[PDB]
Amino acid sequence: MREVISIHVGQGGIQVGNACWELFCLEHGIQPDGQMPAFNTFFSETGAGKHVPRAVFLDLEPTVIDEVRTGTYRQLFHPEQLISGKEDAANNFARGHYTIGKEIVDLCLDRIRKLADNCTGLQGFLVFNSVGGGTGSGLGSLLLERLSVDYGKKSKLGFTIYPSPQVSTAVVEPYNSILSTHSLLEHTDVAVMLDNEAIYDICRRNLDIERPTYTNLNRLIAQVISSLTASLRFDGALNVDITEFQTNLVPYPRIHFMLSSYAPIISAEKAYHEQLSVAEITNSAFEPANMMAKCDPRHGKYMACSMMYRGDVVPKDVNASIATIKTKRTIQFVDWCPTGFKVGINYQPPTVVPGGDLAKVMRAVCMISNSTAIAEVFSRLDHKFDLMYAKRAFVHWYVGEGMEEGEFSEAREDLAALEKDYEEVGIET
Amino acid sequence: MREVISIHVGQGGIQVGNACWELFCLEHGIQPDGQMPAFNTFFSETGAGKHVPRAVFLDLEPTVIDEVRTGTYRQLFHPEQLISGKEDAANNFARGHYTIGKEIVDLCLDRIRKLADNCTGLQGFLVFNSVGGGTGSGLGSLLLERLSVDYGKKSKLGFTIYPSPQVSTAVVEPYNSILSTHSLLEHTDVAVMLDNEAIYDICRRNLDIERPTYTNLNRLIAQVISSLTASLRFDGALNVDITEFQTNLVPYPRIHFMLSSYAPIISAEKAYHEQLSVAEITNSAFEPANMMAKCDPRHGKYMACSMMYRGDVVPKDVNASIATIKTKRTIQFVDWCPTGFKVGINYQPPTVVPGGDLAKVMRAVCMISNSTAIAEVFSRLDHKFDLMYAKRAFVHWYVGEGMEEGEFSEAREDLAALEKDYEEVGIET
Amino acid sequence: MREIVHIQGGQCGNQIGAKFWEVISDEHGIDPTGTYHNVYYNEATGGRYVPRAILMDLEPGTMDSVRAGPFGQLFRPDNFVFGQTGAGNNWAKGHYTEGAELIDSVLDVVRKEAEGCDCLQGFQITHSLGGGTGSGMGTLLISKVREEYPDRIMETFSVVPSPKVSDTVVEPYNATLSVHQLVENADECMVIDNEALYDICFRTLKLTTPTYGDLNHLVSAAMSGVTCCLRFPGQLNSDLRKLAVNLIPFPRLHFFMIGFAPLTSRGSQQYRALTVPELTQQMFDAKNMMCAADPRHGRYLTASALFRGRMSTKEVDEQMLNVQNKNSSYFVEWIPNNIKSSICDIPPKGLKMAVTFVGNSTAIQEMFKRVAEQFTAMFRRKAFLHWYTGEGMDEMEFTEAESNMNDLVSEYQQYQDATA
Amino acid sequence: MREIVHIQGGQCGNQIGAKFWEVISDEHGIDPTGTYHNVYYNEATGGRYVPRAILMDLEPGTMDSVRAGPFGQLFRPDNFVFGQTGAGNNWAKGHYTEGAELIDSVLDVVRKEAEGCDCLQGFQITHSLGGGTGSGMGTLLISKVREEYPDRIMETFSVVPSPKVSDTVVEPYNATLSVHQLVENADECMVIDNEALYDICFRTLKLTTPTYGDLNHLVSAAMSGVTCCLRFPGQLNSDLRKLAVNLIPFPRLHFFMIGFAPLTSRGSQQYRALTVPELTQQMFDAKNMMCAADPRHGRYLTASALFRGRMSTKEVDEQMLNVQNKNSSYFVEWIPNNIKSSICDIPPKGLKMAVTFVGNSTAIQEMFKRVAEQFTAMFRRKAFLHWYTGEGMDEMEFTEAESNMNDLVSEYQQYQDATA
Amino acid sequence: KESYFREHPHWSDINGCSGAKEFEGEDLAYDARIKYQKETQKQWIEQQIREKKMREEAERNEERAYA
């Protein structure tokens, strides 16, 4: 009587979801071919022996969907959930949201309707995507629109891979990323800002690897999401549903852009020479060095923090360490929210994916913080945007596809308002 | 004490009947040899070993009858129940309704009279004729009138194949179909409208068969008709009668044009991934894609849906699944029918035919719906007729067989009467 | 002395009666051959015991139903009066065209089986209200026997169609066609729905897959219970007419509600007790009654409670007075001691006590209102009418039929507001 | 005779109720199979005992919390009224939107378990004031029952939001929105705070790994001791209403403090000795209680001391007088002999004497400020307010509630330092 | 027709009781029933796939012959 739909769109979303299903099918004893030698949340019974995951993979470039169909988990999924287009997205917006996305949106909605009726105790969605891409934003925006006007009450969990400050894999990413804010506010409830450069540095310093890759990226993201959903899936002294976030992390439904953090991210040899108690782990959690987004909260405040401690952890130690961390001077809360740390506990440790660089740990803490510093990120991005739209760069590739250009400034207007709203909640009253 | 007569006139209905008797003999254990190594509804006994099926196979073109008169099943039928002519109707009406029919329909009447006096509790007729050919149209009309004035009281159910929306195997389809509408309204109490492009798309997306053929479509139609007559043939925890079909589905003497659907039409591979419960099957039995007439149920408004099940079923499952169905908002009914879902159960699962792309599965549903969307279909066909009649095209081919010209306009207004009715009843109070 | 004839009708009523004779042969201990192992059965040459009942229907297929299940070996093959064509789920079909043929034979065989009794108290019928054969032929037969046997009473165990769970589509028409006549010539329409039965099966017993046989078993239990203080000794005996007097206060406030106790699951039977306190608390429960009409949303004009077993009459009648005085709001006030108890010195098999509860309540009015609604729609559009016209019946009846329905519920409603 | 029912709501309340039934079975000597090895338990066929308890919650997971734990087989499945969603820390869910879907059934089953008794001494609840499920459902249920039985009493062993160590963020909203009612329709709202429980478990027992099980064990033992002067004989017996008369001067100062004795670690248990002087000196201290309001920062309007075991009543009463005369300032003067005593004649299991202290003191007012103060800093900006605003609330419902809270605490002041 | 004849699968023998103790609810084996049913359907699908593979391979054989 518990379940979540895991919609994966775009390109980064689908690879992150591939690694996520790897981790899930692993920790539940499920074999990658589907059979089995606590899972009603993600995987469901398929009326013939094995189990199938609650997921749908939309994409237009058939390469990644083909790689999934010919990879290891070919027998895992349902040959309908893998919706493959006919061409590429070309890293623009109207070609995934106005002209072509209308070919696949209706089929996707029928498949999502099927998945919804095949479930009873729905609790939410989990969309993974980038926005610097062409279909991860466009088709994602259209899907968010159709769902918000179709289902309603069920809260969506966006996991968007934004553009990092310096590392760049596209030149037009600010344009289509701004083109997604006009629909991220309205239709989406929770948005976990994830960058890349921060996670690259994380893999560099802690995991000691000097040749990291997108696969390790996705492994870490999968770990974070599994630690997020452990409360639904498993035991725990203080369980926390997915309807707890809305009551604990959303002051006003127009400012809901959270950022993640995870611990302990340690290699093999760097755990031997340590202690790694709960106190040290909850100090390391808040360190902006190993935060999973590009932001320095020292130049911001914290509205709320949902911490989920999985593994053998006693509650009194959590309470004491929370008191200490809140008593520190350099980590300051807002005045209008004095009791900010929500905490939950699960009695299951991490389950390391085979072949990973991490180490088995008896404990782990996953923090999701609704903060006010993330706002500057948006501001920074606008900067980039302006320095292009001041000279009408690449506007032709969007106007060629019915996209009324007058939306652009509107977005850069609307997103701009967001900054003001943050400057409305940073007011020390 | 009860049985059905099935007529297969034309070249379409006769192929459908070939596949249909194939499936029937297969399910009742009757080997093609007649001698076998609940069936009184279909087959009678010629006093020794071989069970003769109740049917007449009429066609003026003796090609397909010679396919069966010497094919694999010639041992089965009665050599008098295979009536063949020496020419064709050449797709025009009067030559199969005025000149050549005059000789053959009398012999057909005598043979049907004999089959009637042979059987005791005859309950209904089942004509099998496309309206595309001059045979199935003209012969169909003449035989229908002859029976409606000979027998009368008995119901009639024509599994008639119309011309598809866009594809066709004859260019004079709109003519020799409109002239049969007059016959179909008065004498043919009900009409189970079937098309081809719908079953084409079903085969192209559900059963993964990329290059379908007429034999696949015919096997599927045979399965549908077996599902229809299940309750009469076989055991049943909760049965329905072929008279009960009519009053549960004929709200007015001039709106009785019913479409159909069947589930689960799923290949071997995809069946490995399906909930298979009653919920999902009676959910997919409502999607537009698998409606065996290419219409848009999302647009019209249903009036009355009958549902013949088969395979192990708990009635409370049907009740709860129908609750979920009526809970779906996008589907809507007329005011004068708050109870539109008639059910019926039987305890014989589907039967497999060697070479049939249908995966063996216990549960199965077959829905037949009297709805008001079907009107658009008629209107659609009307358009074709317009762009011909303005130029009197092909008309001399009709006047050259004793058919007055004005009949075209009269049948046109006759079908405009239906386009008036089926969009007059679906109106609020 | 004190016999009962049990007419059937429609495949619904036929299955219900089959299961009822199941439960009766179980209680009296008769194996399916009719050997011992007058109120219900008749002696038969050689020592056999053949049940007294007449089975009527129009789809001869249903015959193979009762001939199939155990205890089907009982009915004499001469009572199986059937037809050929079938019901066709139509009222006028089975009541004006086909009914008008076999009804005479049914009357003659009923006359043959009736005078075989000496003191016949009453009848009881088993049928639906919309099912063609059941509804139509049953209301016609009731008309005939109530114009023939005025002294006796016409008990009727009609299974009402509750439009929440759907099986047919033109049910409201035949439901009204049966109600208009059963209010006119039948004294006890002890209606029963399927919604409440499936509910009692889902929760009170935690049953997962309730098939029609199970619900028929539960109704068979209630039907056996409704007359236990008659064929068995008891400290305060009852009959079919003490029911008739203690319950109906008017010519046409004679529509009822049913209940049985105690019904428990397996995992629950280890945690409770079996005493008249808890049996009573379970009896008045809304979720423990087989009529889809919330009792709390109305009142009780009166009620009878037949206990079976053995217990001090004091605790019984004192707890009756107590459960009346507590909820005196949901009991009518212009009737003193509206409840009535009765005790039988022998319970059914297995258990020790058993509460069969009957209630003439002003709440089951709702169970008709809904039908009215359907009619008021499907009649102004005159939908599905061309069948009910060219077969013997004309529209006229329909109109006036609905009229009476209003009056009926109207009367009930006024006593829900009659205070004095 | 003088029975009590056990309503439990929310995760905290349900877990504490499990631990409390474990302790009660430990005392009365009932193994988990519910056999001996009428005030609380109830009989069932085969000499089985089922506790007169009732479990409710919005998330079904807590079932695998109460049935899995030891002694979890005593309850009855019919007493588990479990929804499917979980109010999700949102008060309005369990009081306006989801509450009113389970309150009907839970009221039905409370009435079932209540009418089954003869002398209903009163209800006693176990829940929290921070969690949405517990707060909302419990307060709505208290509303309905004090609208139903206005003569009996409603004790609530309801915990409060932890002063310092917070684990939720929507805490003050829930606390205020439940106090606004518990001030109105409660009689003994015994309050417990996790911070003081950790203080005890870290300073009075020198423990080193307190799990919620142990806090619940402590509070449940105190719960037992509160009313264990009723189940057993007493040189001077007592019950709930004696407390209710001797402990609330004005009809709204009914929020108590709870303390237990004796409590000892390994060492002190190996060294110290249990005598009435030591128990008294250990009881009337500051950090031997379960409320983060240092009693010296206030006074005791009144305070009862329940003793258990075989002691010398003269020693008890003389030491009551002595501790009242010694710390004369910390008590209140305009109520002479403001300390009350009571003595039972049987100690707990495995002990030879024990003490339960129940003090209606004017020191808790500080608490009803700090939490309230939190509200003032979280409502001036509508922080998280749109959630409750969306489910049907109104801003007035908040503001006046806050004022009510203020009113309440001010009352203490207004009649703490008064005299004549 | 022969309505009401199976109750897939049911019709126990003479044995029974008059009250309401056992109703064959859940059949006391519903779980093993579902497990065996699922195994049977998996066997069916395996056989159908094992056949369709060969029926397809026949086409490639015909294609090689035509080339």
Ligand SMILES: Nc1nc2c(ncn2[C@@H]2O[C@H](COP(=O)(O)OP(=O)(O)OP(=O)(O)O)[C@@H](O)[C@H]2O)c(=O)[nH]1
């Ligand atoms: N964290 C993470 N990010 C990825 C991954 N794969 C791609 N990305 C991001 O995807 C972004 C590139 O945009 P795409 O998503 O590929 O573009 P698109 O919308 O899918 O359109 P097309 O790829 O042209 O079909 C880059 O910024 C990547 O950071 C991955 O495996 N993990």
Ligand SMILES: Nc1nc2c(ncn2[C@@H]2O[C@H](COP(=O)(O)OP(=O)(O)OP(=O)(O)O)[C@@H](O)[C@H]2O)c(=O)[nH]1
């Ligand atoms: N779905 C389906 N359609 C068929 C089949 N066989 C024929 N048809 C259709 O029959 C229609 C032509 O009408 P016919 O009556 O068969 O033509 P005809 O028999 O040659 O008419 P005449 O020779 O002039 O008497 C075409 O549209 C076919 O698609 C079949 O097996 N399955």
Ligand SMILES: Nc1nc2c(ncn2[C@@H]2O[C@H](COP(=O)(O)OP(=O)(O)O)[C@@H](O)[C@H]2O)c(=O)[nH]1
């Ligand atoms: N509770 C219960 N209801 C039944 C049973 N059998 C049929 N019914 C109802 O009978 C109704 C139809 O009446 P029916 O007797 O089948 O019409 P007939 O063709 O005239 O015999 C349907 O709505 C069924 O719900 C049964 O065994 N138990």
Ligand SMILES: Nc1nc2c(ncn2[C@@H]2O[C@H](COP(=O)(O)OP(=O)(O)O)[C@@H](O)[C@H]2O)c(=O)[nH]1
């Ligand atoms: N002393 C003690 N406090 C608890 C326990 N469990 C929860 N609490 C607290 O009770 C509050 C939540 O109350 P809860 O019963 O979960 O209601 P809900 O949140 O609406 O489901 C939180 O502040 C918990 O920390 C326990 O076992 N012992």
Ligand SMILES: [Mg+2]
């Ligand atoms: Mg793309």
Ligand SMILES: [Mg+2]
């Ligand atoms: Mg031809």
